[PDB]
Design a protein around this nucleic acid. Sequence first.
RNA 1: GGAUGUGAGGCUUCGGCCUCACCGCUCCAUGUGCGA
Length: 225
Amino acid sequence: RKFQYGNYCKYYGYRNPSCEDGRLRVLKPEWFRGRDVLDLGCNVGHLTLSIACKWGPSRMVGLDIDSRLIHSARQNIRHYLSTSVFPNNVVFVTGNYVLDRDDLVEAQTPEYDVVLCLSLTKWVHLNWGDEGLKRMFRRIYRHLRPGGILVLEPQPWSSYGKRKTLTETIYKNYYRIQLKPEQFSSYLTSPDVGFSSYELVATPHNTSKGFQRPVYLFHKARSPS
RNA sequence: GGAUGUGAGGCUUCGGCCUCACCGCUCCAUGUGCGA
Ligand SMILES: Nc1ncnc2c1ncn2[C@@H]1O[C@H](CSCC[C@H](N)C(=O)O)[C@@H](O)[C@H]1O
């Protein structure tokens, strides 16, 4: 009924109505081929699986907070069939990526070359506030190996307001937020996170203007310092 | 003998500088020698 995490169970039916995901013309295959990739908030995994079966990542992990979407994603694998060969290169896991303590975030070790954070920032922001959003951002940086990339597709602030009444906590967080999407790039490249450069890749096309969101690349430097 | 480009961010004493990411890590000029 209410989908307070953005955990829609019919999501791609209205994001990509009978059509290709326009982000696949913007994401580049060379970002993924032979790489270890984490897909945050993968939902029922349509985009996760398109990448895993076409662009040959050595490992693709789809993470979502909602176990019912993860079960669906596992059941969606069969629709993409013809160690590094799909479907052996993809796995799904249920979990909340937002850790509840800073020391848990600082314990994160690098495991991935690419982290996808697509259409997730709004939901983390509303449910866990600035603090939870910053914990996700810092954990992503620590999760990436040197040379890694964060692919960030953030929702605009103008789109938060219609969801603010989902729960009292979300409503509370909405009116407490001070780090707005327009400041994400500055925060991600600050010493609190540590990405060393970023670029706007493109804004994909979509049937709905509400899904035409900018896609950014945030780079973790190849040098140790 | 000639040729070092692009982007984002930050700084600047307006000369530039710094970090990262790209793009390359090569192309061009050139015999009054040689004739298997
Ligand atoms: N803290 C969290 N940890 C993991 N997944 C989360 C999360 N908060 C929200 N999500 C998931 O994020 C998804 C947002 S919808 C975006 C889906 C997908 N990334 C795409 O862009 O196509 C939902 O599936 C929701 O369940």
